[PDB]
Amino acid sequence: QVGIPKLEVDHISFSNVVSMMTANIRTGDDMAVERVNPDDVRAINIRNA
Amino acid sequence: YGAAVVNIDLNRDFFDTATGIDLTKGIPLVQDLLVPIGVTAGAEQSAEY
Structure with a gap:
């Protein structure tokens, strides 16, 4: 037989396999971009969707 | 003698x-x-032309 889900039944199980990251996910290398503006505001194509 | 190059310019004395x-x-x-x-x-700057 296959093992019964722990959440299926009313017993309390005080040991479980907790998935976890090996280290902090906040490395500190936050993403940064180079925004570069339109050259002429008049020249922008607002049109077409 | 020795004139390296001779151009035909607009006349600064007039303009x-x-x-x-x-x-x-x-x-x-x-x-x-x-x-x-x-x-x-x-x-x-180009429009100055």
């Missing part, structure tokens, strides 16, 4: 600075006449 023209660059260049809107500074 004087009183005309607002600046011929030293080899083209007429009148500042602040047909200046474009909505562009970064220095983008006006």
Whole structure:
């Protein structure tokens, strides 16, 4: 037989396999971009969707 | 003798600075006449032509 889900039944199980990251996910290398503006505001194509 | 190169320029003596023209660059260049809107500074310069 296959093992019964722990959440299926009313017993309390005080040991479980907790998935976890090996280290902090906040490395500190936050993403940064180079925004570069339109050259002429008049020249922008607002049109077409 | 020794004239390296001989060009046919617009006459500065006639198109004087009183005309607002600046011929030293080899083209007429009148500042602040047909200046474009909505562009970064220095983008006006071609219109001086």
